[PDB]
Every structure is written in structure tokens, then in C-alpha cells.
Enzyme design. Sequence first.
Site, PDB file in Angstrom:
ATOM      1  N   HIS A 122      45.807  38.067  40.808  1.00 12.74           N
ATOM      2  CA  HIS A 122      45.248  37.606  39.549  1.00 12.74           C
ATOM      3  C   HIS A 122      45.922  36.218  39.515  1.00 12.74           C
ATOM      4  O   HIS A 122      47.020  35.991  40.059  1.00 12.74           O
ATOM      5  CB  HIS A 122      45.693  38.245  38.243  1.00 12.74           C
ATOM      6  CG  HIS A 122      45.317  39.686  38.115  1.00 12.74           C
ATOM      7  ND1 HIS A 122      46.011  40.712  38.716  1.00 12.74           N
ATOM      8  CD2 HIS A 122      44.317  40.268  37.430  1.00 12.74           C
ATOM      9  CE1 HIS A 122      45.451  41.866  38.397  1.00 12.74           C
ATOM     10  NE2 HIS A 122      44.429  41.630  37.609  1.00 12.74           N
ATOM     11  N   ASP A 126      49.463  36.218  38.432  1.00 11.25           N
ATOM     12  CA  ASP A 126      50.396  36.894  39.322  1.00 11.25           C
ATOM     13  C   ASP A 126      51.093  35.784  40.160  1.00 11.25           C
ATOM     14  O   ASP A 126      52.290  35.921  40.457  1.00 11.25           O
ATOM     15  CB  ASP A 126      49.794  37.869  40.366  1.00 11.25           C
ATOM     16  CG  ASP A 126      49.073  39.022  39.741  1.00 11.25           C
ATOM     17  OD1 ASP A 126      49.504  39.398  38.633  1.00 11.25           O
ATOM     18  OD2 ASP A 126      48.096  39.554  40.276  1.00 11.25           O
ATOM     19  N   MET A 140      39.646  38.578  48.210  1.00 10.89           N
ATOM     20  CA  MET A 140      39.156  38.670  46.823  1.00 10.89           C
ATOM     21  C   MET A 140      40.219  38.085  45.904  1.00 10.89           C
ATOM     22  O   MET A 140      41.433  38.178  46.243  1.00 10.89           O
ATOM     23  CB  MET A 140      39.050  40.170  46.515  1.00 10.89           C
ATOM     24  CG  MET A 140      38.754  40.664  45.165  1.00 10.89           C
ATOM     25  SD  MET A 140      40.148  40.783  44.027  1.00 10.89           S
ATOM     26  CE  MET A 140      40.823  42.401  44.388  1.00 10.89           C
ATOM     27  N   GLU A 195      34.488  45.976  37.717  1.00 17.57           N
ATOM     28  CA  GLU A 195      35.306  47.203  37.856  1.00 17.57           C
ATOM     29  C   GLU A 195      35.328  48.012  36.547  1.00 17.57           C
ATOM     30  O   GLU A 195      35.854  47.553  35.504  1.00 17.57           O
ATOM     31  CB  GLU A 195      36.762  46.890  38.066  1.00 17.57           C
ATOM     32  CG  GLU A 195      37.730  48.051  38.256  1.00 17.57           C
ATOM     33  CD  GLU A 195      38.997  47.512  38.904  1.00 17.57           C
ATOM     34  OE1 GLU A 195      39.078  46.363  39.297  1.00 17.57           O
ATOM     35  OE2 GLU A 195      39.949  48.295  38.992  1.00 17.57           O
ATOM     36  N   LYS A 235      36.208  51.191  33.974  1.00 14.75           N
ATOM     37  CA  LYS A 235      37.392  51.946  33.547  1.00 14.75           C
ATOM     38  C   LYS A 235      37.019  52.548  32.194  1.00 14.75           C
ATOM     39  O   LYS A 235      36.488  51.776  31.374  1.00 14.75           O
ATOM     40  CB  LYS A 235      38.640  51.133  33.466  1.00 14.75           C
ATOM     41  CG  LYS A 235      39.899  51.989  33.312  1.00 14.75           C
ATOM     42  CD  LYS A 235      41.157  51.137  33.147  1.00 14.75           C
ATOM     43  CE  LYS A 235      42.400  51.992  33.407  1.00 14.75           C
ATOM     44  NZ  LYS A 235      43.558  51.086  33.223  1.00 14.75           N
ATOM     45  N   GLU A 282      37.296  52.270  41.130  1.00  9.53           N
ATOM     46  CA  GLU A 282      38.677  52.642  41.513  1.00  9.53           C
ATOM     47  C   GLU A 282      38.827  54.154  41.455  1.00  9.53           C
ATOM     48  O   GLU A 282      38.374  54.787  40.479  1.00  9.53           O
ATOM     49  CB  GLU A 282      39.688  52.043  40.595  1.00  9.53           C
ATOM     50  CG  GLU A 282      41.130  52.446  40.787  1.00  9.53           C
ATOM     51  CD  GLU A 282      42.133  51.644  40.000  1.00  9.53           C
ATOM     52  OE1 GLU A 282      42.030  50.425  40.283  1.00  9.53           O
ATOM     53  OE2 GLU A 282      42.956  52.136  39.223  1.00  9.53           O
ATOM     54  N   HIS A 315      40.182  55.640  38.251  1.00 11.83           N
ATOM     55  CA  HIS A 315      39.380  55.333  37.040  1.00 11.83           C
ATOM     56  C   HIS A 315      38.297  56.376  36.827  1.00 11.83           C
ATOM     57  O   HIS A 315      38.101  56.784  35.670  1.00 11.83           O
ATOM     58  CB  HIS A 315      38.701  53.950  37.022  1.00 11.83           C
ATOM     59  CG  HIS A 315      39.704  52.843  36.994  1.00 11.83           C
ATOM     60  ND1 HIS A 315      39.401  51.525  36.925  1.00 11.83           N
ATOM     61  CD2 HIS A 315      41.053  52.909  37.004  1.00 11.83           C
ATOM     62  CE1 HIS A 315      40.515  50.803  36.890  1.00 11.83           C
ATOM     63  NE2 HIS A 315      41.526  51.619  36.930  1.00 11.83           N
ATOM     64  N   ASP A 372      38.796  50.007  45.148  1.00 14.99           N
ATOM     65  CA  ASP A 372      40.224  50.105  44.835  1.00 14.99           C
ATOM     66  C   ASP A 372      40.606  51.572  45.108  1.00 14.99           C
ATOM     67  O   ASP A 372      40.041  52.498  44.465  1.00 14.99           O
ATOM     68  CB  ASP A 372      40.516  49.683  43.420  1.00 14.99           C
ATOM     69  CG  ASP A 372      40.594  48.195  43.125  1.00 14.99           C
ATOM     70  OD1 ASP A 372      40.482  47.388  44.054  1.00 14.99           O
ATOM     71  OD2 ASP A 372      40.785  47.842  41.930  1.00 14.99           O
ATOM     72  N   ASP A 424      46.606  56.225  33.345  1.00  9.06           N
ATOM     73  CA  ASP A 424      46.328  55.616  34.655  1.00  9.06           C
ATOM     74  C   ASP A 424      47.607  55.749  35.488  1.00  9.06           C
ATOM     75  O   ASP A 424      48.563  54.977  35.215  1.00  9.06           O
ATOM     76  CB  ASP A 424      45.947  54.168  34.322  1.00  9.06           C
ATOM     77  CG  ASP A 424      45.281  53.377  35.432  1.00  9.06           C
ATOM     78  OD1 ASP A 424      44.893  53.785  36.602  1.00  9.06           O
ATOM     79  OD2 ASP A 424      45.080  52.132  35.189  1.00  9.06           O
ATOM     80  N   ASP A 428      48.043  55.467  39.059  1.00  8.65           N
ATOM     81  CA  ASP A 428      48.128  54.527  40.175  1.00  8.65           C
ATOM     82  C   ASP A 428      49.060  55.012  41.292  1.00  8.65           C
ATOM     83  O   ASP A 428      49.910  54.210  41.738  1.00  8.65           O
ATOM     84  CB  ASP A 428      48.545  53.135  39.681  1.00  8.65           C
ATOM     85  CG  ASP A 428      47.510  52.508  38.774  1.00  8.65           C
ATOM     86  OD1 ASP A 428      46.285  52.781  38.835  1.00  8.65           O
ATOM     87  OD2 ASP A 428      47.885  51.704  37.871  1.00  8.65           O
ATOM     88  N   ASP A 441      45.011  49.528  45.063  1.00  7.64           N
ATOM     89  CA  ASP A 441      45.354  49.075  43.708  1.00  7.64           C
ATOM     90  C   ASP A 441      46.141  50.268  43.158  1.00  7.64           C
ATOM     91  O   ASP A 441      45.567  51.181  42.563  1.00  7.64           O
ATOM     92  CB  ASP A 441      44.109  48.689  42.929  1.00  7.64           C
ATOM     93  CG  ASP A 441      44.533  48.151  41.565  1.00  7.64           C
ATOM     94  OD1 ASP A 441      45.770  48.052  41.400  1.00  7.64           O
ATOM     95  OD2 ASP A 441      43.709  47.866  40.699  1.00  7.64           O
TER      96      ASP A 441
HETATM   97  O1  LIG Z   1      43.654  49.497  35.591  1.00 11.07           O
HETATM   98  C1  LIG Z   1      43.891  48.159  35.960  1.00 11.07           C
HETATM   99  C2  LIG Z   1      42.806  47.643  36.947  1.00 11.07           C
HETATM  100  O2  LIG Z   1      42.683  48.584  38.000  1.00 11.07           O
HETATM  101  C3  LIG Z   1      43.222  46.258  37.526  1.00 11.07           C
HETATM  102  O3  LIG Z   1      44.361  46.426  38.413  1.00 11.07           O
HETATM  103  C4  LIG Z   1      42.011  45.640  38.288  1.00 11.07           C
HETATM  104  O4  LIG Z   1      41.812  46.434  39.478  1.00 11.07           O
HETATM  105  C5  LIG Z   1      42.178  44.125  38.557  1.00 11.07           C
HETATM  106  O5  LIG Z   1      42.563  43.392  37.410  1.00 11.07           O
HETATM  107  C6  LIG Z   1      40.966  43.504  39.291  1.00 11.07           C
HETATM  108  O6  LIG Z   1      41.217  43.736  40.725  1.00 11.07           O
HETATM  109 MG   LIG Z   2      41.729  48.401  40.125  1.00 10.48          MG
END
Ligand SMILES: OC[C@@H](O)[C@@H](O)[C@H](O)[C@@H](O)CO
Ligand SMILES: [Mg+2]
Lengths: 392, 392, 392, 392
Positions: free
Chosen positions: C52, C55, C86, C179, C181, C215, C218, C243, C253, C255, C290
Site C-alpha cells: 500500500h 506501507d 500489484m 476485493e 469483504k 480472499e 473473507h 489473496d 479476520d 489472517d 495476505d
Molecule cells: O482485510 C484487509 C484486506 O485483506 C487488505 O489487506 C487488502 O487485501 C489490501 O488492502 C489490498 O491488497
Molecule cells: Mg486481502
Amino acid sequence: VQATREDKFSFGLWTVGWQARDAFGDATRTALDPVEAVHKLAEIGAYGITFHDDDLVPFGSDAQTRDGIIAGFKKALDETGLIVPMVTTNLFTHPVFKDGGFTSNDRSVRRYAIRKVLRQMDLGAELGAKTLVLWGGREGAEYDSAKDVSAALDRYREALNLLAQYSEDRGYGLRFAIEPKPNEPRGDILLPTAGHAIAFVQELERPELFGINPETGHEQMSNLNFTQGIAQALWHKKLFHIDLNGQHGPKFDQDLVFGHGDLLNAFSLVDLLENGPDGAPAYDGPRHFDYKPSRTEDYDGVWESAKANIRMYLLLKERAKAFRADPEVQEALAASKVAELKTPTLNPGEGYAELLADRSAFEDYDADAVGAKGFGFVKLNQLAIEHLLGAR
Amino acid sequence: VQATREDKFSFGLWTVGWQARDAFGDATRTALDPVEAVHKLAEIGAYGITFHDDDLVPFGSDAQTRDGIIAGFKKALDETGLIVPMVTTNLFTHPVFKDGGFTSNDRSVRRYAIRKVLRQMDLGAELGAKTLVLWGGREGAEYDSAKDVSAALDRYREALNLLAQYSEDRGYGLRFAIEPKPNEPRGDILLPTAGHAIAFVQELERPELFGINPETGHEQMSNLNFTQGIAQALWHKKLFHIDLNGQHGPKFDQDLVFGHGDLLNAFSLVDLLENGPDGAPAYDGPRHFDYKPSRTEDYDGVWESAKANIRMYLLLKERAKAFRADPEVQEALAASKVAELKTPTLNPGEGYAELLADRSAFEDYDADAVGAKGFGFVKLNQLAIEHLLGAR
Amino acid sequence: VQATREDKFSFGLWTVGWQARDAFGDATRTALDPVEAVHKLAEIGAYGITFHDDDLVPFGSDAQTRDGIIAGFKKALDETGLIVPMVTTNLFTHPVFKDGGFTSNDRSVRRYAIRKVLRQMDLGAELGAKTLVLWGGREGAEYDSAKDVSAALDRYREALNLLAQYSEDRGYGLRFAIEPKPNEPRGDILLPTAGHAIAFVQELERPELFGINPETGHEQMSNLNFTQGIAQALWHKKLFHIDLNGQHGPKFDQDLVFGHGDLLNAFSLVDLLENGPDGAPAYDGPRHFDYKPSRTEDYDGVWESAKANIRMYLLLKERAKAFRADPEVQEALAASKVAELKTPTLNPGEGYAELLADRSAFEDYDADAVGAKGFGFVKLNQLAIEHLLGAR
Amino acid sequence: VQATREDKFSFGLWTVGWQARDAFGDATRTALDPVEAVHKLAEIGAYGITFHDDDLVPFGSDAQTRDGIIAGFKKALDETGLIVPMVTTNLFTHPVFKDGGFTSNDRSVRRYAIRKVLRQMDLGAELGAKTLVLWGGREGAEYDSAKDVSAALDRYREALNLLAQYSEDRGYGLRFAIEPKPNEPRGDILLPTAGHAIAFVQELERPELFGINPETGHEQMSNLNFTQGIAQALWHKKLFHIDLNGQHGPKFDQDLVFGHGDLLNAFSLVDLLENGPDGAPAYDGPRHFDYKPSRTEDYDGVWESAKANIRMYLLLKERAKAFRADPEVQEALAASKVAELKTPTLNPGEGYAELLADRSAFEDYDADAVGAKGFGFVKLNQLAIEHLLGAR
Ligand SMILES: OC[C@@H](O)[C@@H](O)[C@H](O)[C@@H](O)CO
Ligand SMILES: [Mg+2]
Ligand SMILES: OC[C@@H](O)[C@@H](O)[C@H](O)[C@@H](O)CO
Ligand SMILES: OC[C@@H](O)[C@@H](O)[C@H](O)[C@@H](O)CO
Ligand SMILES: OC[C@@H](O)[C@@H](O)[C@H](O)[C@@H](O)CO
Ligand SMILES: [Mg+2]
Ligand SMILES: [Mg+2]
Ligand SMILES: [Mg+2]
């Protein structure tokens, strides 16, 4: 892998016997003769069979019919060497039980439900059964104002106390196992989890005669951790029986073959029951499969599925054993400090005053330094799955 | 309707004071000053305030500092007339507690966890608190091989037995309420439902001193019936405190205002707690709101949400009373036989021998006929709903 | 096994870099330097890294600072041979996005969200990124009346059309992946499942440039079948990215590492992706993890957990391969008629006229006889699990 | 209030005719005569009735019989003034459909399923029905390796394309509504959510002829926000029909009266359908109740429950209008900027070039000041609820 009578696998007659009439369709299979069921099960490796009174003798059979059926069933067990470790009563099918057995708002239904059970206790005792399982499927409600839970619990208790009185007096030596379920068929069922069932039993007159019979899918219907739940039942010493099957989280009761649902949990469960303290299992009763052969199968599919349950349990045991025997696992266990939880927090004879005087437990403690060390849990978990996968 | 000290509404310092820093974002609100919170809470009708140690005195404050805060705090209490019915300890935030406080695999964290709580007990005692709530949010695991559930319960018990010892020696008169939660922050938390917590408590050394502090949202995270679980807790006499809030089934912990999630269950809960035995409430403790003002709100929103909690409760109370006073509801209740559940199944002096002798409880019982009469439960439910909507 | 660049395993900078500050506690790890993260990932076999904007370049970095970070980043990339397949934009952390990015009720926030994304497209285009993933984590509501969904979808579409426009005009050749969720951080998020996202994508001005980035956890948060949803995404040809992670049904969530949640669904997922039609994989984009290293771990657990994702994928891949090459599995597939679904229901050139004319399709159809044949699905499921278990 | 024919309340014959045979017990009610049903419903205020082929004419009725039944049925409609707004076909009950109708692995079943639907389309066309609802209750699987999802979607498409073809050629003028459901009776059903169903429809040959028929409980079984889903469905213009009922989250399909499950979401849904733009309802089709009178009820509870569905919708409608008409609500909506979402993000004629040139949307934007202002959503929510409680 091969099943022995020492494995203690049991099946309910209503499992392989399920004709597959679900909520949305007609039966896809014909009825299974109890005698044939006994011979087939004996054949696939089971050591015992269980049944609901109405599974063996059709609701409303005269004593002549009833008697005849019991006689043949009895011969079949005789010839095969199968035992009846548990019996149960059907307090959910007949319309009279639409609001429950023991906790129906209708007083007459409550007296009738007790009678139905006393009778089944008689047969159980004659066949040598040691546990009476009570599944209160219709005890509960769809609407909050319809059921006084407190009164309900009083009447559940009242009925159970009478049952233990009778058993004790007739000298049947039975143990009672309450089976928790969150819902289905009632909107919400009384004593929804292993925890609620255990707390309730602690209030009976002779609590030592009562435990629970938790079912894998039942706890999974609420998305709870079945293994952790069993661990607590074991800690309390209330694991009197167990129903094994598969489920895929919160949805209708699936009753899949054991291990066909949450496979990772099925693994940790076998490990818990089998790798008990000192090599020996932590649990000694029947490994009972309360499942249903999928609606899409025929009798071939039926026997297939019966053996899949045994197969899944023996494959898992085998890997649980290998897991624990692995020195690398042994090392990771050490690093994660799993066994350090067994050491009392307090020193021998240490109390509040000695603890308050210990500066290392607080004043001089470096929380930040201890807070930064990892527990190595992902690694230990990865080792477990590699064992399950047969990759180690 | 307006709030009285008699209603006993209490709030945690951490509810209105939540900065709205969530798992995916920064805080949207600035810190709330405790003296300020006492003053604003006093103003909206709260009778008491609660707090974790670290909510009042920042983790690691030197004594001069800590001493200073308490003094200011006590003065605010003094001036507003607010009490401290309950106190709790933060055993979940600091990294040292990443694997638990009382049940961490690390023995030194366990020892430090006890010291941090003893210290909070002294302050609670000092402020007049009557209940110590223990929320074991970090007790549980993400992976099954990481935590020995049995050893964890022994250590959870070892720690509570010590706390009760000290409270009793010192003459503090505290009651301990364990708070169950199924998950979050841990994958699975030990003692996940009200039931699991009650069953556990029955196993401590001085059980009479232990009860539970169930939270609306926590039971709902498992899709369980909250009112029905409180009914069982009251039956066991273990409802020592309650945390009210709202939630929308199984998903992360929402902490909405009470009644903003499952409204029908919020209605049946208020009915249960207030339309108790005599005419009198069935529960006499604090009505504690453990909620969080949504992240989208500023301080006007915070104060609005605090008042909403009280408003939802008084509005529901009002309708619950009206429901019960309605002649049409009385008639519906009589048709559904709700009250008949309160009549013992057995006649006075009747045992299994007399039941067995009653041909009408079985041999001559017309189950078909009984099973055909309706309970009229939908109609009763509809009347309840219409009272809630102020439609009658 | 060992991962090859051909495996196309990628990680987000935010996965291994998660400092482990959860909703209830402080971080347990210090921050990971992006260059260091590049080196470490390269070393474990990753072919790419994603991130991101926030990040890599701290929110609000001056242009000199941002330029410097980007330059060192590029050097690491260069030196390791890792690519950036990506990129994505953080539209959920800063308080400004508390009601969403593209769909905030506040107009000005919608304008700033679009500029934040445009700036990231430039950087993505410069690093050679081919996909822009859009996770609208804050687009949604906690209360139904707070958000006009229709207006919200209009605004969503309005923003996405501008983005395609700019890309096509700049010749960036990006593909966009939305994506889905269901919830967290908002009570309800817009475009809650893979299905909703696909249906929305179909309404954009240039639908061919848009797909989804589903994902694992999700979809499992709603207790949906991830593999089955992926199968549908592939039928629509809208699987632009994926993901991979682990989750235990409906709850926050988690992960977890891929395969540490629903193992059986992870297995059938790898079978779907790699054992596609014509020998080859059904999907050729990145296999992106992810996930988040558990809060209990230190940097050793972090790398352990990154490698576990790859091991998990490779082990399941090996077992999926063996499954399909098993003559017994093939025989089971034949018996269960899986491939017969691939044959049109209608004969070549048959229309309704001819179908209506075929008495064997109705008039002379023996429903009852066909209805009695078993499909042998349980047996097929059993061979599948025996392969996964390494028992075959 | 009172129901008018303009309210367009319709009911399926299988709703009030449900004999209450559940997965665990026998029917508690006798069969309902269709002519009586017509009469009974006409009497409570319904404007139309719907049915599955097999609800009206027993499976395997000879031509004579079938003809006989239809003729009496048409008389009752005649006499009463009820219409048949929609018709549906049973592709889930008979054992032949155990693996599905349209997507059964068995090709002969697929052909038969098509035939059975064609026949119902004729009867539907003859009775004046405008919509064909298609509920693929048996389309899915219990095990992932048993169903090729892609082929199944191909076969589903293939069957629908044909039905459209036929209808258009016969000049029937039917619209088709696909009904999504996540599970039950199959472990996983194809097209599990409104989302998935819309995405699929978009791939048909004459998509303008297809839409969806979402059911309140179906979306709630996966814990999705029904109102938000219908808002999306309306955005897409695919709300061809709707099934209204109640459910208590992820558990078996309850089928309670509309508003007896998630009351707050029933409120917001009624508001969305009726308080449409230009004062008028956003939805003009049938308000169809697909529910089931609880098993604890007799025929009195059955008519009681039918009336409850109507009473709930009209009570909710009445509060939704009061809510929108309240000035303080108007004031809250303004403070929440609910309508500002309707104003495009870009000024007329602005594209990315002009947006890029606006320093105020980025370079000079003060995200921090914007991020500090609250939206007043909690207050807006509280006003909505007080309107629902009749407290304002
Ligand atoms: O639940 C959070 C989500 O999974 C996030 O990690 C996205 O995947 C990202 O912001 C785009 O890749
Ligand atoms: Mg994700
Ligand atoms: O979900 C139904 C339940 O599992 C039932 O099969 C019981 O186990 C039985 O009535 C006693 O064993
Ligand atoms: O899940 C949060 C939990 O409810 C916490 O707020 C406790 O209630 C508190 O630590 C004891 O009251
Ligand atoms: O879950 C059952 C399903 O809802 C069924 O009642 C349909 O809606 C019907 O097949 C078409 O109306
Ligand atoms: Mg069972
Ligand atoms: Mg709480
Ligand atoms: Mg329906």
C-alpha cells in the site's frame, strides 16, 4: 489400518439406517432391518450398536410384536459378539413432543415422557447398556415469551432426579449423559453447549451419576472449538460418551463422516483422546459415530461411509502418535513452553504474602523484555499439519 | 422517561473514553480525562463508573503520579455522588500478556498477572467496589497444540483461589465475576460461553464467592440466545454482574449501544431482568454498559451514545411492563400454558413407583390427541412484538 | 519441495511487516524495513512483493523523503530480482476515511481519495505493476439509515471509471481488481462477497478492465465455500488476482497462514487452480499471501510463517496432483459422473420442440428408478482425503 | 391498519399448507385443501397466491385428475378475485433430484428437469402468472470433488436460455427470477447470495428477461445485511420479486413470520421498498411471504401467523413514513450528510485532468481537520429506533 474391538467403535442404528428424508425431500433409501444392520456393522469392525427405543420397536407395537423384535435383535448380537454400550429414547419425533418431552408446557406430556424413558431404561438394563444418553432436541423454543427457562430447568431436573432414583433402586448401575445442541429442531434448545450441560448436571441430586455426550457438529454449529470443549469436559471428568461426526460451521446439522468437516480439529481431537497421560488414552468409552450417509448414496454408499468413519479415526490416530513421537515436535513443544503451564504458578507453600514480598513478580519485573520473546507457535502448528499430511 | 440512581446505570471509563483506534485505523478521538468522564456521566444519569487499572493510572506511573490521580478521581466521585460498583484489571494490552495473564505458557507472566490484580483489588477495596470482574481476553490459543487446556484450567483455578484467599483474609468482601467470550483477540478463548464459565466456577475452592459477568455481544458472537443464557445464570444464582451492548451475530465484537443489535432479544432480556418473581426485578446489580461509541463520531456523538444506552433500557422496560399488564397477553399466556411449566410434573409424594402405576401417564395416554392441539405461540409472539412497537 | 519464480508466490509488505498491534493490544514487534523485507522474501522464494502507498512511504512524507525511499526500494528490487506485480492504496487507516474513501458521505473526502489513488497508479506504473487492487474496507455502514447504497454504488462507479480513463490515457495498461469483504472494520461493507463484486464490475464503463481479488478468509467470514466461489469467478473470467490465507469460519479476520484454517477447502482450492483444463493451471496470476504472523511470534516466527505459506501451497499441490493421477480416483470420478456434467443437456441441434417431442425425457421417464441409484460421492470424498493425508 | 389489494401481499400454497414435518419429526397438521387456502387467504387480505406444480397437483397425477384440480382451483380464484402473480416448479423433493435438477451429474435428470419446468410454464401462462421463480435447492454439493462448478454453471445457463426461448416464442411474456440460498438442503448451493445470482444472470443470452428473487432468511443464513443486498439488487434493476420472512442468523432455515427475526433489518427494508424516490415505492412487485407457521401450532395458529406477516409489514410501513417525515430526523440526515452522497464527486465536465489540477483535493487538503468531525450516525440511528418503538 485395522479396527479391533479395543478401538470401541459404535454406530447408532439410526445412522446407517437413515433413509435420507430431509426437510426438503422424500427418502432415497429403503428401511434397514436391525438384524442386517447388526451383521453389517459386526462385519465392518464395530464393537457395539446403540438405538433409540423407536428405532428398534416401531412406536406403538403391541407387546407381542415388541417382544418378538427384541428376541431376534438379541440373537443377532449373540451370534455376532456385538454389545449395546448405550441406549437412548426418542423424545422428539412424535407430534406430542412438539414443545419437548421433559420440559413441554403441557404437564401430561411431561409425565408421558418420563414413562417412555423408564421403559427404555428397562430394555437398556436387560441388554447390558451402561449409559443412557438423553438428547433434549425439542426442549427449548422459537419465541422468548413462550418458555420460562427457569421453570424449564426445574422440570428437567425433576425428571432426571427420578430417573437416577429408579436406576439406583433397581440396581441398573447406569450413567446418564446429557447431549447438548444449540438449535435444530427448536429455534434455540435448552443447554446449548457442553459448558451449559456441565453446569446444569452439577445441580442434580446425584451429580456423580451424570455427565455429557458432546457431539462434534453440535459445538461446531456455534463455531466453538470442539477439542478445547472436550478438554474442559475431561478436566471436569464429565466426558461420559462422545458422538463423532463432521460439520462445516454454523449451518444445519450436517452429520458428515468424522473428519470430513473441520479436519484440523478432528486431528487435535484424536490426539487429545488418545495421547493421554502416560501413553494411555485420556478417554475410555465408546468412540460412537452419530452421522448420516449422504442423501445421494445408496446402500453401497451407506457401508462405504460406515467404514470411512473408522478409517478416518485410525489414520488420524496414527498421525497424532507420530506427531508426539517426533523429536523435532518435542523440541518445538519445549520452545513454546507448552509443558511449563503444568508447573504451578506459585512455589510450594507460597501464598499471597510471600508473593507480595517477591519483587521479581512485579516491582523488579521486566515486562518489556519478556513481552518481546516469541512463543514459536506457528512453527509447532506447521509441524502438526506436516504430520497430518504425512509429509514428515 | 428519566434515569434514577435506583436504575443503577453504570459505564466503564473505557467505553466513553474509547479513542476509536481499531484494528485497521488510527484513533479518531482525543483522550478523555477521567474527572471529566465522572462529571459527564454524573450528568446523563449514571449512578456509578468502573475502570481497568490502566484506564485511570497509565501503565508504569510512579507512585507519586499514581497517588495523585487517585486523589483527584476520588474527589470527582465525592462531588458528583458517583460510586464504583466494580473494578477490573487490564491483563490484555501489554505485550507481556500476548499468550495470557493467568494462563500464559510463561510462568513469570502468570506470577506478574496475579500481582497486577492484587494491586487492583486493594484500590477497588479502597474505593468501595463490591465486584472484581475478570475478563481473560488473552487466555486461549490460535493453534490447538499450543495450549494444554487442562493445565490452563488448573492455573486459572490456582490464581482465583489465591485472590479469594486474600480478599477473605483482608475482609474486603469482594465477589468475583468471570467474563466469558468465545474469541477475539485469541482465535479461541478459554471459557467461551456463560455455561463454560459457570461450570468452571463450581470447581473453585470457595464457589459461593464466584459468579459470571456475561456480555450481550459475547454470547451473540456464537449466535446463542442471550436472554436464555441469562435465565440459566439466574437459575444457578451466578449472575453477579452484567455487561449490556449490541451485536449483529457472529463477526468481530461490535460493542454497539444496548438494543442497537438484536432488538427482540434486548426486549426479552429487559422483561426477564425487571418483571421478576414478586413484581420485583429478578436481578438487583448494576446495569453496566460495556459499549463503544462508533469511530465515525466526535465527542458530541460520544455523549449522545451514552444517553442512548439509558434511553433504550428505559424504553424497553416500559413496554415489557405494558406487555405483562395486558389482559390479551394474559389470555395468550394461558392458552400457551407457560405457567403450567411451573407446576411439578409429579404430584406431591409421587415417585417412580406411583408414576409407573399410572396407566394414564402411558398405557392409556392418547398421544395423538395431545399432539394435535396447538400451543398458540406465534400469537403470543405477535402480541409481544406489538407492545414493543408501541402498537398497543 | 522448493519454490521457483515460476510458482509466483508474492507477499504484501504489510504481512511480514505487521507489528501485531491488534484491537486489544500494543504491537509486539518493531517495524520491518522495506529493503530488509525485500531481501528476506527473495531469500525464501517469493517472486514479488506488493504494498500500500502508506506501507512504503509514511503518510505525509515530503517529496524528498518519498523520492529517497522509492529509490532505495528500487535498488533492493533490482539487486534481488523481485518484481512488484500489484500495488494498492491505503484508504482505511487515516481518520479522514472513517466513513470510506470513494463513498464517504463527505464530498471532499471522495475527491481526496481519488487523488490518493491516482498518485499510487503513477508509482505502480513506474515499478511495472500490472494490477491495482482496490479494498474498500471503510465503504459501508454500522447503521442502515446512515448510508444510501444506491448513491454509494453510483459514487463507487464514478471513481472507478475515472481511474480506468486515466490509465488507458496514460497507457499504463493496468487491470483493476476489487476485493470484497463482508464486514470489519465497518459493521457491513459494500460489495460483501465475490458475487456482489462481480455483479458490480459488470456495470462499469469498461468492464473488461475490471475483475476481483477475492480472499480466502473473507469468504469464510460468511461461511461460504471459497473454492466454489473461485470456480464461479473463473467461469466469469474475473479472477484478476487472489489473496490466500486461513480463517476459522465467522469471527474477526484471522489472517492465518494459507491452509491453517479450512484445510479441506485449501486442498480443493489448489486442485482447482493447478489442475486446470488441458493439463495447465486454470489461473496464472500471482499466488499472493495476505496473512499476518501471529501476535505471539518474534521475527523468527515471522520468517517461519512466511515459509509455511509456501510449504503449505506446495504440499497441497503435490497431493492434488497425485489425487488426479490415481486410477482409483478416476474410476470413482467415472462412477460419480463428474464429467457427464460437461456434456450439453441438449443434443446438437436439439431445441425445445424436439425436447418436448422426446417421450424419454418425461412421458416414459422412470424417475423412481433413476432416483434410487447412488452417486458414490462419499467414497470419492474419502479417496480425496486419503490423498491429502498421504495414506495413498 | 388493514390490507388492501394495492399492498400486493401474496403467499405460497406451501406456506400456510406446511404440515410441519421437519428433519426430526412427523407432520403435526393435516393437509390443507387448495380451494380452502384460496378462500382463507382471500379473507385475510392477500391479493394473490403462488405455488409449485406439485403443491397443487400431486406428483404423478393422470391427465384427468390434473385437469380436474386445475379447474376447481381456477373457480376458487374466480370466485375470490385472487390472482397468481408467480408460479414455481418443484425440483427438490423427488429422489431423482437428489444431486440437482438442471445441474444433476446425471444427464437424464437434467433433461427431465427441463421438461417438468416447461410444463409448469404452460400452466403458469394459462393462469396469468408474470414471473417464473427458480429455486435450485438441490444444485450444489456436499463434497468439492463431486461437482464441476464451471460445467454446472454452463448447464444452468443452457437450461435457462432454452426456457427464455420457449417463453418468447409461445408469447408467454414471463420474466425469470433466480432464487439464491447458501445451503440446506445441499451442504453448499450454487449461486449462494443475491450477488452471485445477479452476476450469473448477466451471462445469459437474454439477460433483460432475468432477475432475482432474494429471500430475507437466505441472506441472513450467511449473516449478510438483507436491506443492503436488496439496495444493490434495485441498483442493478434485478429485483423481479422478493420473499419475505424472518431468521435468527446462521443456523437452519427458520422461515418465521416477516419481522420476527431481525426486527431492525425488517424496518430498514420496509423503509427502502416504500420510501422510494418521488415519494413512491422503489419496488412495485408482490410482497410475497415465504414462511412457515411453527410446528407447535394448529390451523388457528396457521391463520394467525398469516395475518401476522401482513400486520408486521403494515406496522413497519407506518413507522418508516413517520420516521422520514420527522423534522428532527431531517435535521439528523443533514448532519450525517446522507444526501451529499447523491451529488457527484466531480463537478460537471471535470475529468482526471481537472481533478489533478485541484490542489485543494490533495496538496492543500487538511485530512486531519476533516478526520476530526463526527458524522452523527449514532443519533440518527437512535431516532430511527425510537420511531420503530412508537416512542416518538
Ligand atoms: O482485510 C484487509 C484486506 O485483506 C487488505 O489487506 C487488502 O487485501 C489490501 O488492502 C489490498 O491488497
Ligand atoms: Mg486481502
Ligand atoms: O442431532 C440429533 C442428535 O445427535 C441425536 O442423534 C442424539 O445423539 C440421540 O437422540 C441420542 O444419542
Ligand atoms: O471484550 C472486551 C471486554 O468486554 C472487556 O471490556 C471486559 O468487559 C473488561 O476487561 C472487564 O469488565
Ligand atoms: O428454502 C426454500 C425456498 O425458499 C422455496 O420456498 C422457494 O422460494 C420456492 O421453491 C420458489 O418460491
Ligand atoms: Mg448425537
Ligand atoms: Mg465486557
Ligand atoms: Mg423462498
